[PDB]
Amino acid sequence: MTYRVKIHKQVVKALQSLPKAHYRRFLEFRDILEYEPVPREKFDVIKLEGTGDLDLYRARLGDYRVIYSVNWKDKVIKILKLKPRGRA
Amino acid sequence: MTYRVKIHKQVVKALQSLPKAHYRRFLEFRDILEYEPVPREKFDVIKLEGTGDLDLYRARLGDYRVIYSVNWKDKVIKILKLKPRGRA
Amino acid sequence: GDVLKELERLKVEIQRLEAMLMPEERDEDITEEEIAELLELARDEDPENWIDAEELPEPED
Amino acid sequence: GDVLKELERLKVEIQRLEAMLMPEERDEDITEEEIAELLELARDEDPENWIDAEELPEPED
Numbered sequence: 001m002t003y004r005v006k007i008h009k010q011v012v013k014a015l016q017s018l019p020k021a022h023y024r025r026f027l028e029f030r031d032i033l034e035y036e037p038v039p040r041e042k043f044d045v046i047k048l049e050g051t052g053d054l055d056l057y058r059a060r061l062g063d064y065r066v067i068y069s070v071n072w073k074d075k076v077i078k079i080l081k082l083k084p085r086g087r088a
Numbered sequence: 089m090t091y092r093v094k095i096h097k098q099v100v101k102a103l104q105s106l107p108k109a110h111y112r113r114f115l116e117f118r119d120i121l122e123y124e125p126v127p128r129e130k131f132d133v134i135k136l137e138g139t140g141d142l143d144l145y146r147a148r149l150g151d152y153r154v155i156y157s158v159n160w161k162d163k164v165i166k167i168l169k170l171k172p173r174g175r176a
Numbered sequence: 177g178d179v180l181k182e183l184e185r186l187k188v189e190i191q192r193l194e195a196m197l198m199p200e201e202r203d204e205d206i207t208e209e210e211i212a213e214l215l216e217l218a219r220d221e222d223p224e225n226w227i228d229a230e231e232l233p234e235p236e237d
Numbered sequence: 238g239d240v241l242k243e244l245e246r247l248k249v250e251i252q253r254l255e256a257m258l259m260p261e262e263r264d265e266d267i268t269e270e271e272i273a274e275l276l277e278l279a280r281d282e283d284p285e286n287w288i289d290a291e292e293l294p295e296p297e298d
Contacts, residue, residue: 002184005229008217012227020235030229038195040262044132047198049211055195056214058203060132062173065203069218072192079229080217086132086203088113088150089245093290096278100288108296118290126256129202134262137272143256144275146264153264157279160253167290168278174266199258 003034003070007079011066014082018064025061033077037070056080090123091158095167102170106152113149121165125158144168 007015015023032039038057039045049056054071065083070076095103095118103111120127126145127133131154137144141161147154153171158164202211217225263272281287 002187006226007229007232009225009227012232015232020237024235027232027235030232033229037191038198040198041265044134044264046132046201047195048200048202048206049215050196050198050200051215052196054215054218056211056218058206067206067214069214070192070195071218072188072195075188078218078226080214083205085150086205088204089241090248094287095290095293096281097286097288112296115293115295118293121290125252126259130204132203134264135256135259136261136263136267137276138257138259138261139276140253140257142276142279144272144279146267155267155275157275158256159279160249160256163249166279166287168275171266174264176266197260199260 001034003037003075003077005030005033005077005079008081011079011082022061022063026066029059029061029066030079033068037072037077058083091121091125091163091165093118093121093165093167096169099167099170106170110150110152114154117147117149117154118167121156125165 015026018026029039029043032042038047039059043059043061045057045059047055048058048067053073054069056067056069059066059068063085065086066079067081067083068077068079071078103114106114117127117131120130124130126135127147131147131149133145133147135143136146136155142157142159144155144157147156151173153174154167155169155171156165156167159166
């Protein structure tokens with residue numbers, strides 16, 4: 001439970017367009033995020049904006065990418081938005 | 089004017105089984121490698137091994153990974169191996 | 177309780193330390209712009225915009 | 238080979254530095270044995286085992 005994970009409303013909606021399989025992967029990402037805020041190896045994550053307070057990150061789940069923030073002080077991880085494979 | 093890129097013979101095999109579009113992405117990768125040895129933002133490059141002199145990097149060229157080395161002293165870059173999306 | 181929360185606290189600090197040691201970076205797809213909007217969103221605390229991930233559905237299969 | 242070649246040398250050093258500040262990171266399926274092997278692969282200086290990347294032509298449509 002280390003970290004509390006929250007999802008933005010619009011992400012939840014976009015999540016329903018995903019195949020059962022992809023959704024399952026997202027839930028695993030959520031489960032891991034609660035223990036490890038930056039699972040670099042397993043999700044090829046990169047720090048977008050680092051600022052001592054909240055950091056922005058980009059995780060790769062395969063067919064798509066998820067961008068989220070980590071509030072170290074409050075221990076809150078927020079799933080901000082989703083993105084395509086990366087058109088290249 | 090900058091780095092000299094080489095491709096190992098064993099890799100040529102993997103290359104000719106690459107769809108034309110993916111192959112083209114590889115030739116572009118090669119050209120950027122000539123000036124920017126670690127095009128992180130462009131091909132999600134990570135440093136696998138950092139023996140300060142000769143390093144190993146893994147680059148993503150879409151739905152396949154490219155493993156290469158950079159020899160900082162020789163200014164030589166070698167394309168070593170090609171890999172799938174990557175989980176098992 | 178008090179001993180374990182301290183232990184969890186330490187774990188967090190250590191994790192944020194390694195995060196600190198990570199270089200900033202983007203993908204073509206992501207602009208400084210969008211990053212600004214993202215920090216903006218990240219700091220938005222209005223409930224209507226969020227839901228706990230734990231209350232997400234569990235596979236149908 | 239000039240002051241430019243020297244300018245080139247500085248650039249290489251700077252990029253080298255950028256790389257040094259980077260953290261070692263691997264993919265789940267990449268092991269120490271594979272790394273050790275890639276490493277030996279990279280040490281090969283046999284002109285015949287490699288081909289100049291620039292020998293490759295930009296394909297016809």
